[PDB]
Design an enzyme around this catalytic site. Sequence first.
Site, PDB file in Angstrom:
ATOM      1  N   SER A 151     -11.344  11.432  -3.181  1.00 29.81           N
ATOM      2  CA  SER A 151     -10.761  10.985  -1.838  1.00 29.81           C
ATOM      3  C   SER A 151      -9.341  10.907  -1.869  1.00 29.81           C
ATOM      4  O   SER A 151      -8.530  10.823  -3.127  1.00 29.81           O
ATOM      5  CB  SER A 151     -11.294   9.743  -1.392  1.00 29.81           C
ATOM      6  OG  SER A 151     -11.060   8.725  -2.230  1.00 29.81           O
TER       7      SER A 151
ATOM      8  N   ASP B 268      -5.663   8.564  -0.095  1.00 33.91           N
ATOM      9  CA  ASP B 268      -5.215   7.558   0.734  1.00 33.91           C
ATOM     10  C   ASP B 268      -4.111   7.922   1.523  1.00 33.91           C
ATOM     11  O   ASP B 268      -3.009   8.594   0.860  1.00 33.91           O
ATOM     12  CB  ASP B 268      -4.672   6.379  -0.008  1.00 33.91           C
ATOM     13  CG  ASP B 268      -5.911   5.547  -0.766  1.00 33.91           C
ATOM     14  OD1 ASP B 268      -7.284   5.653  -0.293  1.00 33.91           O
ATOM     15  OD2 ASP B 268      -5.817   4.669  -1.547  1.00 33.91           O
TER      16      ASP B 268
ATOM     17  N   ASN C 234      -7.246   9.637  -5.054  1.00 34.24           N
ATOM     18  CA  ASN C 234      -8.310   8.505  -5.837  1.00 34.24           C
ATOM     19  C   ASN C 234      -9.137   9.535  -6.900  1.00 34.24           C
ATOM     20  O   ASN C 234      -9.017  10.552  -6.693  1.00 34.24           O
ATOM     21  CB  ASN C 234      -9.189   7.752  -4.873  1.00 34.24           C
ATOM     22  CG  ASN C 234      -8.570   6.869  -3.953  1.00 34.24           C
ATOM     23  OD1 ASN C 234      -8.773   7.037  -2.646  1.00 34.24           O
ATOM     24  ND2 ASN C 234      -7.443   6.185  -4.389  1.00 34.24           N
TER      25      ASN C 234
ATOM     26  N   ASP D 163     -12.173   9.391  -7.467  1.00 33.85           N
ATOM     27  CA  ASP D 163     -13.467  10.057  -6.930  1.00 33.85           C
ATOM     28  C   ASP D 163     -13.012  11.140  -5.829  1.00 33.85           C
ATOM     29  O   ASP D 163     -14.004  11.898  -5.397  1.00 33.85           O
ATOM     30  CB  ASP D 163     -14.128   8.964  -6.099  1.00 33.85           C
ATOM     31  CG  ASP D 163     -13.426   8.654  -4.629  1.00 33.85           C
ATOM     32  OD1 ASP D 163     -12.185   8.149  -4.906  1.00 33.85           O
ATOM     33  OD2 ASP D 163     -14.114   8.841  -3.717  1.00 33.85           O
TER      34      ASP D 163
ATOM     35  N   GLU E 163       0.861  -1.140   0.074  1.00 29.52           N
ATOM     36  CA  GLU E 163      -0.110   0.071   0.034  1.00 29.52           C
ATOM     37  C   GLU E 163       0.825   1.276   0.029  1.00 29.52           C
ATOM     38  O   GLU E 163       0.680   2.263  -0.878  1.00 29.52           O
ATOM     39  CB  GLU E 163      -0.910   0.096   1.251  1.00 29.52           C
ATOM     40  CG  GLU E 163      -2.168  -0.983   1.371  1.00 29.52           C
ATOM     41  CD  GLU E 163      -3.029  -0.592   0.099  1.00 29.52           C
ATOM     42  OE1 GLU E 163      -2.977   0.415  -0.734  1.00 29.52           O
ATOM     43  OE2 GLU E 163      -4.193  -1.556  -0.173  1.00 29.52           O
TER      44      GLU E 163
ATOM     45  N   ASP F 220     -15.169  -3.647   9.735  1.00 26.95           N
ATOM     46  CA  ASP F 220     -16.100  -2.887   9.442  1.00 26.95           C
ATOM     47  C   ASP F 220     -17.126  -3.666   8.439  1.00 26.95           C
ATOM     48  O   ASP F 220     -18.228  -3.509   8.116  1.00 26.95           O
ATOM     49  CB  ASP F 220     -15.873  -1.544   8.436  1.00 26.95           C
ATOM     50  CG  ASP F 220     -17.165  -0.506   8.332  1.00 26.95           C
ATOM     51  OD1 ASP F 220     -17.552  -0.298   9.572  1.00 26.95           O
ATOM     52  OD2 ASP F 220     -17.405  -0.570   7.308  1.00 26.95           O
TER      53      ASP F 220
ATOM     54  N   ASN G 247      -8.190   5.715   3.626  1.00 25.13           N
ATOM     55  CA  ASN G 247      -9.171   6.683   2.392  1.00 25.13           C
ATOM     56  C   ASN G 247      -9.858   7.668   3.329  1.00 25.13           C
ATOM     57  O   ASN G 247     -10.427   7.299   4.313  1.00 25.13           O
ATOM     58  CB  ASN G 247      -9.972   5.862   1.686  1.00 25.13           C
ATOM     59  CG  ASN G 247     -10.515   6.494   0.651  1.00 25.13           C
ATOM     60  OD1 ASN G 247     -11.709   6.767   0.467  1.00 25.13           O
ATOM     61  ND2 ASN G 247      -9.731   6.954  -0.391  1.00 25.13           N
TER      62      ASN G 247
END
EC number: 3.2.1.17
Length: 129
Positions: free
Chosen positions: A50, A52, A46, A48, A35, A101, A59
């Site tokens: 967002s 990381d 990202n 969209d 990562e 989650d 995120n």
Amino acid sequence: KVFGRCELAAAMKRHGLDNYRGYSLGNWVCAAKFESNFNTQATNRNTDGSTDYGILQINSRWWCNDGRTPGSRNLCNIPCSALLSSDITASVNCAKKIVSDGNGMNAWVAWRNRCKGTDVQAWIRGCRL
Ligand SMILES: CC(=O)N[C@@H]1[C@@H](O)[C@H](O[C@@H]2O[C@H](CO)[C@@H](O[C@@H]3O[C@H](CO)[C@@H](O)[C@H](O)[C@H]3NC(C)=O)[C@H](O)[C@H]2NC(C)=O)[C@@H](CO)O[C@H]1O
């Protein structure tokens, strides 16, 4: 901070990631390697909008607040910059919420595509753990 492989393994274990939700320490070291390449300051945008952040590329759409992610939750209730510290405590606490989650470590795309199902014990080889 760029962690060494065993340095990060020991920090993650100390922060209670070893076997957290059944994921062995090697899974977390592997995920961090792919990562962020063990770089606490890693940031990646990202499409969209967002971002990381940190050693575990957490995120901003769901877990942290960076003030520039429309539609964001801050489920870890933490500034995303706090995920870039040389001390990974905040990243680990947030990762514990993320992996709990519902979709486990599949939350980390690099883990799913590069670590899941592999011989993850290799990531902790040689560490005094
Ligand atoms: C490491 C990291 O931040 N990874 C990001 C992913 O978390 C994110 O995927 C979305 O994550 C949320 C939170 O886990 C998912 O929500 C959960 O979805 C399940 C059903 O699949 C449900 O049981 C949970 O209640 C729900 N949690 C909440 C708090 O609502 C969501 O489904 C994921 N969406 C997708 C498309 O994977 C992805 C995508 O934004 O980004 C990663 O960087």
